[PDB]
C-alpha cells in the first residue's frame, strides 16, 4: 500500500518541515520541552538546587534526546516526498542539510555525555533552539527592515550618542567634586548610558542641584532619542506587515507563469528558422514578463496599469477620430 | 556553421522586409501577423527592448546570430521555471497532478491545443504515474 | 400603555446592554463603583487600615450588591425587546447567558458572605470587572493584531532572547569573581532580564569595567529589541484603526442585502421547473454576491471595480468599432 | 421521483437548447433573456462558477439534479439572512417597521412590484403589528 | 496716517494673536521668560538657595509683570483689526475673552503681591503658561486621537490591569513569607505597578527564585502591555499628521465657497414666484455642496469622483449607442 | 596613462566622498578606529588603567593620525574628478570646504600634541566623528520630521509637563512630612521627572500610602505621555521612509529635464522677434514644468493626472458628440 | 396669506406641469431649462434629496409652502457663510479687499455679470473704503 | 531702444491678431500653429499663467517688453539646469559622455534634429574629449 504510506509520510513531512496551520502546536510542544531544559539547566547552576535540578534534568535529557532522535528519523523518512530527497542519494543529500547535520551532532553529543559537560549541554540546548528558525527568516526580516530605515536609525544613534556624551560630560563637571558616584569620566558615561536608556539602576545619580538641573534638561531629550530606534523599527515592521498583507491579495503570478511555461515549451518545440526566431523572441518576452511580475508586485503597478489604459484610451479614440474623418468625405 | 549562418540570414531577411539591415517594429509585427499570431504594441516594444543590445531600437544580423547562438544550457532559466512551478504546485512538495495540469495549463496563458497537451504528457509523464515531477522535465529541457 | 413601556424598556436595554453613546457614562459610574471596591479590598489587607477599610467596605458592599441586583432585574426586564428573549422561555434563555449566570452567582455569593471570605470577595470583584467586556472583544482584537504580526513579534522575541542569554552569560563571565551580585548564572540571567527590559531595579549591576563595557554594548541593542514588541503592536493597532475608519465609509452592504432578500423570497415564491431553476441559480448568485461583499470589504475592491470597468471599456469600444465597420460598407 | 426527475430533465433541455448535455453561458443567457430578464456577462459567469461543481465550465443533468435536490432546510442560509437583516435593522434589536420596509425594500436590489410587497406583508406581518419580526419569517422560510 | 498705523497694528496682532511663521520666536522668548520664573520659584523653595533665589526672582517678577502688561496693552490696541473688536464696545468684548480676563487678573495679582503668596505665585506662573494654548488645541487634539483609538487603548488597559493584578498576586504568594518587601498585597501591587511600568525603583523586588521566575514570565508580557498605549497613541498621532498633510493639498473649498456666495446673494436678490423658488432650491443645493465639501474632505472622495465619472461614461456611451442605432435606419 | 589614473581616482573619490555601496565598509572600519580612540580616551581617565590606557593610546594615535593624513591626501588628489575641484585653484577651493579645513586642523593638532592636552584630544575625536555626517543630513532629517509633527510633539510635551508638575506637587503634599525624600518641592519635581520618564533611580520614592496611591494614578498616565514623543517620532520616521520608498519608483524627472534642456538651448538659439518670443515663453513653460516636477513628486499627482484625463475624456466625447450631430443633418 | 398662498400654488403648478400634485425630476428639469439654466442629473437629484422631506422622492404643495415659509432669519446660514469668507479671506482678520473680490468672486462659482458685481459693491461697500467687511453684510443678509 | 521697441511691438501685433491690445489663448494658439508646432490646452494655459503678471488672463505690450527685456544674466536658471544635468549624470561627478548625450538627449523631450545635435556638440564639446562638462557650457549660456 504505497498510496496510504505516501499520504501519511507527506502529512508527517508537512508537520515536521515548514508547517502552515495546526502543525505549529506540535512544534510549540517541542519548544516547551527544549525550553524546560534551559530553565532546568539554569537551576542546575544553583548550589542549593543542584541536586534536585540535576536529578530532574537527567530524566528530562533522556526524554528530549529520545524525542529528538525519533523526530530526526521520522523526518529523514518523510523526506521522501521531495523529489531531490528520494532514494539513497536523495536522503543522504537531505541529511547533508546544515540543520540536519547539526541535529545529528547534538543527538550524538547528548547520547555521549549522558553515557563535566554542562557548558556543552547549555550550548546544545541553544543550538536546538536556534534550529527552529532553520532558514534565517528572523535574521533576514530584521536585516531587511533595518536596512530600509538605515538612515533614520543612524541619525537617531548619532544624535543619541552626542546627547549621551554631552550630558554625561556636563553632569561630570557639575558632580566631579561633590559626588563620589562621578569619580571619573567613565563613571559619568556609565551613568548617562544607564539613564538615557531609562534603565536607571540607581547606583549613580546626580546630587548637586546644578547637576540635577543639567541631568533633567538632557534626559528629557536623551530618553526620547534612545527610545527612537524601538519606535522606528516597530513602525517599520507594522508597515511592512500591512504592505505584505495588501500585496498577497491580487496574486498576479498565475497567468504569467502559465504563459512562461507555454512559451518555454513552444520554444523547445528559411521559414522554419524565422518561426524558431519568433519563438525564441517570445521566450525572452515570457522571461521579461515573469520577472516584471516578480519584482514590483506592488500597488503602484495598478497606477501603471491605469496609465497604460489611459494611453490606450487616447490611441483608441484616435482611430475612432480617423473613422469619423472618413465619414466627412462620405 | 556556414549552413546555420546562411539559414539565420535567410530568416533575418524574412524578418527584414526592407532589406536595409535594420529590423523595426513594423516589419516584425507584419511578418508575425503573416505567421498568424496578432501582437500588441506593448508586446512589440518588449521584443525590441529585449533584443536591442546596441542602443538604437533596431537590430542587425550580428545580434540575431548572437541570440540564436545561445544554447539551452546557458539560458539560466532553471530557477525561474522552478519558482513558476512552485507557484503552480499548491502542495509545494514538487509534484503536479495530471488532472490539475490538464485543467490549468490548457486554460491559461498561451492556450494550447489537444495535440499540445498530448505531447506535454508524452515528454513529461514518462512513468505515467499522474503526479508528474518537473525537475527531471526541466533538466531535460535544458538539455 | 404598552407603547411607552416598550419605549422605556428599549432605552433601558440600550443603556444596559451594548451601548453606543452617552450610556457609557452610566457604565463608567458603575465601573468606578466596582473600582472603589478593588481599592478598598486592597486597603483591607493592611493591618493598620484594616479597621476603617473594612468598616467602609461593608457599606460599600451593601451598596454595590444592591446596585448589581437592581441592574440585573432591570436587565432581565428590558431583555423583552429581543425576540429571542420574549416570554418565560425567552427570558429564561436570556438568563442562561454566561455573563448573566455569572452575575446572579456573584450576587448570591455577596449576599451570603455579607450575611473568612476575603479571597472570594477579591475574586468576585475581579469577575464583575471582567464581565464588562461581555464578549471577549478585547481578547479577540488583541489576538487578531498579534496573529497579524506573528512573524515580526516572534523574530523580535527570538533575537531579544538570544541577546539576553548572550549578554547575561558574558557579563557573568566578566563578573563571576569580583561581584557578589553575579554569584551564579541565574543571577546574571535575572540581571539581564531586568536591564534589557529597562526595569533596572539596581539590586544587581555590573561593577568590573570589562563587565560594564559588555553590559553597555549589549544593552544598547537589547533594550531596543525588548521594546520592539510594544512598538510593533502599537503600530499594528493604529494601522488597524485607520483601516477600519476608512472601511466604514462606503457601506456597500445595503444593496447586496436587498438583492439577497428579494432573491431569497422569489426562490421561495416544463417551463415552471425551468423558471424555478433560474430562480435557485439566482439565489446562489445572491449568496455569492453577499459573501463577496462580506469578506473583502476593502479599498482594493475599488481597484477591482476599476479593472472591471477597464475590461468593460475595452468591450464597449469593440462594439463601437464593429458599428463603424458596418458604416464602411454602407 | 420519476415525475420530478422527468420534469427536471425537461427544464434542463429547455436550458440546453443544443441538446449535447452541456449547458454553456450562451444557452442560459438566451433562454433567460427569452424569459424576460436581461443578464450581464459577470452575472452569467458567476452563475457558471456557482453551478460548475465539475471543473470544465459546463453543466450536465446530474449537477442540476443535485442542485434542485437541495431543500430549504439544508441551505444553511439562516445566519446570512440574519446578518443581512441586522444591517437592515437600524435599531439592531431584531424588528423592522412596516413603513421602513415599504420604503427601503421595494426601492433597492431586485425591485419588486405592489403584489410582491402585498405578499411579503401577508406572509410576514402575521400579527399586523407593523414592527415585523423576521426570525419567525426566516424559520418558516427554512421550512 | 491711518494706513501705516493700521499696517503696524495688524502686524502686531499677527505676532501676538495666532501667529504663523517667525512670530513664534517672540513667543518662545516669552515662554523662556515665564519658564525661568518656574525654575526660580522652585529654587525659592530650597532653604539653602532661598536668599539668592528670591533676590533674583524679585527682579525677574518685575520684568515679567512689566512685559505682560506691555503685551496686554499692545494686544488690546492691535485688536482693532478684527471687526468684532472695534471701538469701545468691540475692545471691551475683546477684553471679555477668558484668556484676556485671566491675563489682567494675573497682572493685578502680581502687582499686588509685589507691592506670604508663594503658592499664588506658583499658580499664576502655571496659568500664564497655560494661556499659551489659548484655545484647547492640545486638549482637543489629544482627545480626538484618544477617542479614535478608544477600543485599542481600553483593551490594552484591561489586559495590562489583569496582568498587573495577576502577577502581583502570584509574586505575593511566592514572597509573602521570605521577603519583607511583600508584607501585604498592597506592597505587591505597588511592586507590580512599578515594574510593569518599567520604573523599577528597586525598593521592592522578588528574591525567592519561584518569585523571580513568576516575575520574569509576567514582566516579559506586562511591560509590553503597559508600553502599548504609548505606541498606539504615537502611531495614531503620526498617521493623523500624514492624513492632514495629504488632505491639505487639493484645497477644494474655493469653488464651493464661491458658488455658495453667488447662490446666497441671488436668493436674496406667477413666474416671479417660480423663479424665487428655483433660486431658494439652488440655495439649498449650495448649502448641501458646501457641507459635503466640509465633512469628508478626504482621499476617498477621489474614489467617489471616479465612480461618478464611471457612471457618467456609461450614460454617455448609451447616448452614443442610441446615435449609432439611428444610423442603422439611415 | 591618464585614462587608468582617472579611473582609479574616480573610484577613490567615490569611496571617500559620498559612497553608495560596499564603500561604506571602509568608512565603517575608519569609524571603528576613531571609535576605539573614544574608548581608550575614556580608559585614560581612570587612574588604575591610566598607564596601560595611555600606552596603547599613543600607538593608536600615531596610527589614526597617519590614516587620517593619508586619507586627506588621497582625498585632495581624487577631488580632481569634480570640475569645480580641478587645477590649483579648484583643489584649493576643495580644501576650503569646512570639513576639509576641520580635517587638516585636527591633523596638525594631533601632530603637535603628539610631538596636558587630554581635553583637546577628546574634542578632536568628537570632531572627527562628527565629520562623518559632512552635510548635516542627520540634523536636517530630524528637523524635518520634528517640524512635521510639531503640534503633536508640543501637545505631548505640554500635557506631560502639566502631569509632571501636578503629580509631583500632590505627592509632595502627601509626603512632605513622613518622608525625608521629599524635603522640598525641588526634590518632588526631581522624583516626578525621574519616574514619569521611567528612569526610576530609587533615590526618591513615595512611602505614605496616600502618596503611593497618587503616584500610581498619576504615573499610569505620565509614563505614557512621556513615552509619546518617542512613538510619535518613530512613526513619523517610518512613514517618511515608506513615502520616500514609494516616491523613488516613478522617477518622472527625466523627460521634464530633457524638455528643459532642449527649450533652454532653443531659447538661446517682425517674424523673427515673434519666433524668439514664442521661444522665451516656451522656456518659461519648461521652467514651470520642471518646478512642478520638483516639488509635488507625490502619489497625489497621479490623482491629478487622472483628473486631467478625466476632463480630457469629457472634452473628447464632446467632439465625438459634435461629429454625430453633423451626421444628423447628413 | 391668501395672496401669498395663491402665488405659491401658481408657482408650484408652473413647476408641476403634469398637474397630479407630485413634482418629479423631469418637470423641474424641463421648466428650469425653459428658464434658461441647464442642470445636471446630480444637480436634480440633489434638489430632490434636499426638498424631499416626505420619503417618496416627489414633492407636494405643503412642502413648498413650508420651504418658502422659511425666512432669512431662521436659515441659520450665518456660520456657514462666515467660514466660507474666512476661506476667501487670505489674511483671516475678516476684511476683503475690493480688487481681490472683483478678481475672484466674478471668476469662480456661479459666474456673475457686471451689473451683479456693481450691486454687490453697492450693497456691501457702503463706506466705499475698498476693504469690504462682510459681518455687517451677512447680518443685513439675515434681515 | 527705439528699434528694439518697434520690433517688439511688431512681434506683439503678429501675436495680437485682433489688434485690441489684449492677447488671448486663441490668438497665441492660432499664430504659433501657423508657425508649425501644435500646442495643447494645458500648454496654452500654462503660457497664460506664466506670462499673466497683471491678473486678468490677458497680456499687453508692457508685459512683453518687460519679459523680452530679461537677459540671460538674471534668469537665475543656473541651479535649475544644474540639478537637471545631475539627474542626467548617472555618475554624479559633473561630466556627460558624448555617446550617452547623443542617445538620450535627441530621443526625449523636445526632439532635436541632426543639425541640432551637431550644434550642441560644436558649442559644448569645445575640447572634443567626449566627456562634455556642462558647468562651462551653462556659464556661457548665462552670457
Ligand atoms: C539594531 C538596532 C535596533 C539599532 C540599529 C543598530 C545600532 C548600532 C543600535 C540600534 C540602536 C540602539 O540600540 C540605540 C540607539 C541610541 C543611541 C545609542 C548611543 C551609543 C541607536 C541605535 O541605532
Ligand atoms: C503578547 C505580546 C505582547 C508579545 C508576543 C508574545 C510573546 C511570547 C511576548 C510578547 C513579547 C515580549 O513581551 C517581549 C519580547 C522580547 C524578548 C524576551 C526574551 C524572552 C518579545 C515578545 O514577543
Ligand atoms: C490617556 C492615555 C494615554 C491612555 C488612555 C486612558 C487611560 C485610563 C490610561 C492611558 C493608559 C495607561 O497610561 C496605561 C495603560 C496600561 C494599563 C494600566 C493598568 C491599570 C493603559 C492605558 O489606557
Ligand atoms: C526633540 C524631541 C524628541 C521632542 C521635541 C522637543 C522637546 C522640547 C522634547 C522632546 C520631548 C521630550 O523629550 C519629552 C516630552 C515629555 C514632556 C516633558 C515635560 C517637560 C515632550 C517632548 O516634546
Numbering used by the authors:
A (entry chain A), C (entry chain D), E (entry chain G), F (entry chain I): 70 to 184, 195 to 348, 535 to 595
B (entry chain F), D (entry chain E), G (entry chain H), H (entry chain J): 6 to 148
Tell me what the authors wrote about this structure, in their words:
To probe the role of CBDB, we introduced an alanine substitution on the residue Phe104 in S1, which directly interacts with CBDB. Electrophysiological studies show that the activation of CBD is largely affected in the mutant F104A. We next collected cryo-EM data using the F104A mutant sample incubated with both PIP2 and CBD. Interestingly, two different KCNQ2-CaMF104A maps were reconstructed from one dataset, which were designated KCNQ2-CaMF104A-CBD-PIP2(-)-I and KCNQ2-CaMF104A-CBD-PIP2-II at 2.7 Å and 3.5 Å resolutions, respectively. In both maps, CBDA molecules maintain strong densities but those for CBDB are barely observed. Interestingly, KCNQ2-CaMF104A-CBD-PIP2(-)-I remains in a closed state with no PIP2 bound while KCNQ2-CaMF104A-CBD-PIP2-II is in an open state with the PIP2 bound. The number ratio of particles used for the final reconstruction of KCNQ2-CaMF104A-CBD-PIP2(-)-I and KCNQ2-CaMF104A-CBD-PIP2-II is ~4: 1. The differential distribution of the KCNQ2-CaMF104A-CBD-PIP2 particles with only CBDA bound in closed and open states indicates that with the presence of PIP2, (i) CBDA alone is able to stabilize some KCNQ2 channels in the open conformation, which accounts for ~20% of total channels, and (ii) CBDB further enhances this stabilization and dramatically increases the ratio of the open-conformation channels.
